[PDB]
Amino acid sequence: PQVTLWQRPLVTIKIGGQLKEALLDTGADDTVLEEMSLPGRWKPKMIGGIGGFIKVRQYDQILIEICGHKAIGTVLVGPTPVNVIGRNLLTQIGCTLNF
Amino acid sequence: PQVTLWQRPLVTIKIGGQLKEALLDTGADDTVLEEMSLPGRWKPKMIGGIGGFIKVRQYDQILIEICGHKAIGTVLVGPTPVNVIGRNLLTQIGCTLNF
Numbered sequence: 474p475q476v477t478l479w480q481r482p483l484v485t486i487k488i489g490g491q492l493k494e495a496l497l498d499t500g501a502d503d504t505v506l507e508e509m510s511l512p513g514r515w516k517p518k519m520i521g522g523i524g525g526f527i528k529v530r531q532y533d534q535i536l537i538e539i540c541g542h543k544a545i546g547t548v549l550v551g552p553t554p555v556n557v558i559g560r561n562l563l564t565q566i567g568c569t570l571n572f
Numbered sequence: 573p574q575v576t577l578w579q580r581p582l583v584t585i586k587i588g589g590q591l592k593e594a595l596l597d598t599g600a601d602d603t604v605l606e607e608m609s610l611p612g613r614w615k616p617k618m619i620g621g622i623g624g625f626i627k628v629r630q631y632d633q634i635l636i637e638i639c640g641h642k643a644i645g646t647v648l649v650g651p652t653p654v655n656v657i658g659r660n661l662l663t664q665i666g667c668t669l670n671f
């Protein structure tokens with residue numbers, strides 16, 4: 474649906490059978506979520522942001538439902554203070570930016 | 573225009589009579605710019621990111637032209653690695669997310 478930016482653009486996600494809210498984040502290449510137990514194997518990796526870098530675990534091929542749409546892809550879990558949905562999944566749910 | 577998110581959503585800005593590219597960033601509450609020269613009064617301020625916190629300088633009521641649209645707002649300059657325009661300017665430019 475359409476969202477204005479007077480408030481942070483927060484949605485519900487279900488991931489790993491857990492419900493969370495998350496930020497839709499156009500500045501973010503990748504999705505990164507607070508620490509969480511997902512099933513499966515994961516590769517260690519690192520991402521940079523404002524402030525510097527953090528090490529995260531990368532899980533691939535996980536199902537997430539963001540609003541009502543499902544999408545599969547790579548999700549980083551790690552020490553972020555907010556759950557962010559980056560452009561990798563944003564593209565799958567058909568999200569555009571408009572002005 | 574409408575932007576899809578297969579690429580970083582980069583826009584040209586003119587600020588302080590300098591030309592820069594910046595990312596349109598829905599997850600950023602504030603706009604923050606790499607170190608560059610602005611005239612006038614600033615204040616210290618600290619922001620949070622993934623990775624950590626950075627010490628930044630708050631300048632108020634700077635005019636920015638963002639994709640040619642004008643806005644006047646607080647911009648933070650400082651050690652970001654990428655120039656970010658955040659929700660405080662995005663709302664003035666009339667920017668919306670659609671899915």
Ligand SMILES: O=C(Nc1nccs1)c1cccc(CN2C(=O)N(Cc3cccc(C(=O)Nc4nccs4)c3)[C@H](Cc3ccccc3)[C@H](O)[C@@H](O)[C@H]2Cc2ccccc2)c1
Pocket residue numbers: 498499500501502503504505519520521522523554555557559597598599600601602603604618619620621622623652653654656658
């Ligand atoms: O893919 C990624 N990294 C990779 N590296 C290598 C390969 S992939 C990646 C994925 C998600 C996020 C980011 C890193 N990231 C952030 O650090 N911030 C902090 C931010 C940015 C701008 C402003 C604020 C802000 O207003 N903070 C405030 N503090 C106090 C008041 S306001 C905060 C927020 C998200 C956020 C909001 C609140 C709290 C914490 C974070 C942005 O919205 C994100 O797009 C992005 C911006 C960015 C992108 C690249 C380099 C530097 C910065 C990177």
